[PDB]
Structure 1
Amino acid sequence: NEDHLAKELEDLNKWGLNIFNVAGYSHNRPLTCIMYAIFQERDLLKTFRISSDTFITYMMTLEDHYHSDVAYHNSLHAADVAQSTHVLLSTPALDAVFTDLEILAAIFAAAIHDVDHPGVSNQFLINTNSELALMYNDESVLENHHLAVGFKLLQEEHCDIFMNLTKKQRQTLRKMVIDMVLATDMSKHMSLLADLKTMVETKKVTSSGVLLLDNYTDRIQVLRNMVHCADLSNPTKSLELYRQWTDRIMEEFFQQGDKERERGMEISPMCDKHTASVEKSQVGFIDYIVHPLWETWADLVQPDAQDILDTLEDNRNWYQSMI
C-alpha cells in the first residue's frame, strides 16, 4: 500500500502521473496526498513556514468540501489540476521567471478551483435562478463560489496555511488566486487566448531560451493561462487516462441533462444521453477550445510542450476515428 503509493509518486514532476492510482493507494484522498507531496517537493512548507499539521488539516477540510457523489468535479479532478499546474510551473522556458509566492498561488488556486461543485454548469444555475447566480449577478457564478469556499476554510481552526506570509504577500496572493480561479470560467476563454497570442507574437527570449516577462500584467496573464491549460489538460494526457476523464465528465453531463429534462428546460449541449455522441463531442471540444489554447501555449514555451501537443492531436484523431 505504502510502497505502491511511493511508486506512483515517482512521477510527481511528470505529465501523466496516474492520479487515479494515487486515489486508490491513498484511500480516496488524492488532493491531500498530492498537495502534501507537491509542497514537500517544492520546499513550500519550509519557505512559507507552514506546519505539516496546519497544511494537512486545511487540505483534508478542502478535500471534504469536494462532492464525492459528483462524477467529474470532485477531489480527483482538483488533485489532477494541481499536479498538472505543478508540472507546468517547472517548464524549462519559464525557469526562474516566477517568484515563490506566484508558485504557491498557482498550486493553491488549482487545488481550490472547483471546491463545492454541485455537478452542474453556470448556465444551469443562471436559468434556474439559483441563490449563487443571484449573489454574483450571473458572472463567473461557480468560480466566485469556489473562491469564497476556498478562502473561508482558511479561517477554520488550525487551517490558516498563509499565517506566516507578510501582509503584502497575503494581499498579493489573494489577488493572484482570484485571477487564476476566475480564469477557469469558459466565458473568459477567448479573451485569455487573445492575450496569450499577443504575448507569443511579441515574446522576448534569452540566449539560454527562457521567456522574459517585463511587468506584473504579463506574469499574471501567463499564470491565468497556465491554470486554464491545466484545467483543460485531460485530452493532452495518455489515452487510457483521457478515456477515464471522458467517462466521468459525460456521466456528470448526462445527469444535468436529466435534471434539465424533468424541469422542462432545454437540454444543454453534450447533455442529452439519448442523442449525444461522446466521440463527436470530444473532437469538437478539442478543435474549437483545447487545441487552439495548447497550440498557443506550445508556441509560447517552444519546444517544451511538443510531446503534449502531439498527444493532444493523436487523441483527437483517435476519438474522431471512433465516431
Structure 2
Amino acid sequence: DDEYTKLLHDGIQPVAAIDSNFASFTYTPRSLPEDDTSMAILSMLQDMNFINNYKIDCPTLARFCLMVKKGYRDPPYHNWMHAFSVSHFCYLLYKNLELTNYLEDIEIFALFISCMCHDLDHRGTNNSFQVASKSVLAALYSSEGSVMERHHFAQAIAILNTHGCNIFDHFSRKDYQRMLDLMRDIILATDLAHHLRIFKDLQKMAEVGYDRNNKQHHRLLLCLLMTSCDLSDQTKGWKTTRKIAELIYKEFFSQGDLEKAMGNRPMEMMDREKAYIPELQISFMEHIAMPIYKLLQDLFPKAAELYERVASNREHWTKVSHKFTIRGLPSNNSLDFLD
C-alpha cells in the first residue's frame, strides 16, 4: 500500500536517474531492488513515450502495474523479478533496435505489457504437471494445451477488468480488441511448443527477409521478440546465467519432488537424483536459446552481440562442467556422503 502511495504521488523518475547504464544490453535489471521495480516500469513506459502517446491514465497505470506485480507468486524462478527483467529486456530492444522500423507502436506497446503479464500467477510447475496434478487449471485448459499460458492470459484479462486498472479502456473498440488479440497471441507464444511450431516460419521469414507490409511477419516477429525477452537472462554475464540455472533447477526439482510424492516419475530434468545440470543447461542453450538469438541476429544486425554473449555463456558452461565431478575429497575432507 505504501508502494501504491509512492507510485501515485512521487512522480515518474527519469531512467537515467535509475542507472546511467539502464538502457544498455550490459545492464542487469535483477540488480534493481524489487521495491523500485514498479517505478522502473513507469519510467520505461514514460521513456518510450507510451504514456503520452496513448494518453494513458497514470493512476490507472500505477494500479495496473501493482496488480500485475502482486499477481506473481514466489517460486524460485517464475516470480515478479522474472517478469520485470523480461519487461526490461523488451525496453532494451526498443532502445537499441529500430523496432519502429519493423512494428507498429501498438504492437510494441502490447509486447511490453505482455512481457509484464506473461507468467502471471505461475505456480513453479510446467504444463505437463497441471495435467498429472489434476489442478483446477488443467480442468479449465488442458483440452486446448498451453495450460499455464492460457491461465497467464486469463489473469491479465482479470487484472484489466478490475476496477481502476483498465489502462486501455479509452482505446477505440477496434484498438481495444487488437490489444487483447495481441496480448493473447504474444502470451501464448511463450509456450515452447508454440515456438517449436512456428520456428521454420521464423526461419523462412529470416531468409526471405522481413516485410513490414506483411502483417503475419509482424505477428511472427512479435513471437520471436517475446521469446527473446523470456530467455534474456542468458544474454548477460556468466554470473547471471549461473544464478538463474540455480533458481530454475530449484524450481524444477521442487516439482519433481511433488511428482514423486503423488507416486509419479518426473522428467529427468525435474528429478534431483538424475538431472545433470551442465548437460541440461548446455542443451537448452544450444537447442532453444541460441537459435532464437541467431534469428534475432539475422533480422537485426545490431542484435549480434546478444547472440555472441549467449554462445559465450554456453562455452563457459562447458568449461566448468568438470566441476560437477568430485575429484579429490569433498570440502568436508570426508567420504561420509557415500554412506
Map 1:98-109 → 2, pairs under 5 A: 98-109=103-114
Other-structure match for 1:312? 310
| Counterpart residue number, 1:132 | 137
**How do residues 189-204 of structure 1 correspond to structure 2 at under 5 angstroms?**
189-203=195-209
1:196–1:297 CA contact under 8 A, matched in 2: no
SS of aligned partner of 1:158: coil
Q: 1:61-100, aligned counterparts within 5 Å?
A: 61-68=67-74, 70-92=75-97, 94-100=99-105
The CA RMSD measured in Å over matched residues stands at 1.9
Q: Judge conservation of contact 1:291–1:312 (CA < 8 Å) in 2.
A: yes
AA of the residue aligned to 1:15: F
Q: Which residue of 1 aligns with 2:3?
A: none
Q: What is the distance in 2 between the residues matched to 1:93 and 1:269?
A: 41
Contact 1:8–1:21, Cα closer than 8 Å, also in 2: no
Mapping of residues 204-283 of structure 1, within 5 Å: 212-283=211-282
Of stretches 289-298 and 169-178 in structure 1, the one that deviates more from structure 2 is 289-298
Choose 1 or 2 for highest CA Rg: 2
1:298 aligns with 2:297: yes
Separation of aligned partners in 1, 2:98 and 2:50: 22
Give the superposition deviation at 1:20.
2.2
Q: Distance in 1 between matches of 2:125 and 2:226?
A: 21
Q: Tell me which moved more, 86-95 or 70-79.
A: 86-95
> C-alpha separation between the residues in 2 aligned to 1:278 and 1:185?
22
- Give the whole-Å Cα distance in 2 for the aligned partners of 1:117 and 1:319: 28
Q: How many residues align?
A: 308
Distance 1:134 1:164 in 2: 35
1:201 shift after superposition: 1.0
Partner AA of 1:174 in structure 2:
L
Is 1:41 the equivalent of 2:47? yes
User: Normalising by structure 1, what TM-score?
Assistant: 0.90
Determine helix, strand or coil for the equivalent of 1:101. helix
Structure 2 runs not aligned, ≥5 long: 1-9, 322-339
Report the CA distance between 1:308 and its aligned residue: 1.0
Cα distance in structure 1, aligned partners of 2:146 and 2:305: 32
| Partner SS state of residue 19, structure 2 | helix
Distance 1:122 1:180 in 2: 17
Unaligned 5+ residue runs, structure 1? Answer: 205-211
The secondary structure found in structure 2 opposite 1:159 is coil
What's the TM-score once normalised by structure 2's chain length?
0.86
Distance in 1 between residues matched to 2:170 and 2:72, nearest whole Å: 26
Per the alignment, in what secondary structure is the counterpart of residue 11 of structure 1? coil
Query: What code does the residue aligned with 2:21 have?
Result: D
The alpha-carbon deviation at position 298 of structure 1 amounts to 0.9
Counterpart of 1:107 in structure 2: which amino acid?
F
Aligned residue number for residue 208 of structure 1? none
After superposing on structure 2, the runs of 4+ consecutive aligned residues of structure 1 that deviate more than 6 Å are: none
Find the aligned partners of 2:237 and 2:187 in 1 and give their Cα distance.
Answer: 25
Could you say which residue in structure 1 is the equivalent of 2:6?
none
- 1:93 deviation in Å? 5.1
Structure 2 letter corresponding to 1:13: A
Q: After superposition, what is the alpha-carbon deviation per residue over 1:60-81, rounded to whole angstroms, capped at 9, x for unaligned?
A: 111111003x110000000011
What is the alpha-carbon distance in structure 2 between the residues aligned to residue 202 and residue 93 of structure 1? 19
Determine helix, strand or coil for the equivalent of 2:76. Answer: coil
Percent identity of equivalent pairs:
26
- Give the Å deviation of 1:190: 1.6
Deviation of the 1:91 alpha carbon = 4.3
Please give the secondary structure, in 2, of the residue aligned with 1:289: helix
Q: Deviations over 1:234-293 (max 9, x none)?
A: 222221222221121111011101111111111123121223222221101111111122
How far did residue 89 of structure 1 move? 3.1
Q: Distance in 2 between matches of 1:229 and 1:197?
A: 15
| Partner SS for 2:268 | coil
